[PDB]
Amino acid sequence: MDGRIKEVSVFTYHKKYNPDKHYIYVVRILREGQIEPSFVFRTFDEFQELHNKLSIIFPLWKLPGFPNRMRTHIKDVAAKRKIELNSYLQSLMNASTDVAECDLVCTFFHGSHH
Template structure:
């Protein structure tokens, strides 16, 4: 039995609109294999999200489930709140971050980068062999397409306590600020995005816009800076 081929290079080339079974966008990806073959595949954002969830479930240590500082699995570009952005613009803006995500993924140790889930994701599927002849969205200059929704909605939380970052992987927070949640970690640290930057923050500083804290808003575990909140919501660092 010949050895299983491995992934050598992945390049996200463009974004394409599809109309079947409903309007959505797919990323055109060129995959180069150890066999020398180069193939084109088409994946929508929701499939990347599914892959990311599989990876975090299969590799909890490498996904930073216990200690976010030990994470080596790359972050997937966050879900988008579509009512604020045109869907086509969102798809285009995601292209470079998704390309960087793919490159980072295949540069991980082989037990991750060449695992079944990754190989199956990048393998050519029947629908990749005869893609519909659709226009690449970069060629379209005008017109709105508000129905083209890949139904992934980003959660937003309000900052209820100031926080000053302790490490380069974190960001500082100010009361009243609204952040987008990219990923929730059971350690009590969440990876969030603001208009200016992305980074880890204590979930205890955040509250849902309905005034309710999430079930994962636990006290951050020791190892990323020990952080407590007083009843007046003021941050207090332990000695």
């Protein structure tokens, strides 16, 4: 119930069996202009990079806490991040309008893969 983005969530995730590879999070976005949601695909490192960019331009008191990380607790980490990244996105969009609507946040939400 903000700008053009009205709802965001981490819809699901997939990938990586064994170690080497990585997980991708599906982010579901509902905008005031459309009836159906859009979906983009973002890694944990993309979310952490978005927070790191925001920290360049904003003091941390303006931003949500980021669920920082990346032989671990298996891939219960993927399931854990689905929840934490969703809480991050909700806090971000419920931030002051200067943060929730800034070009860095708008850019993160544009482009399936980019």
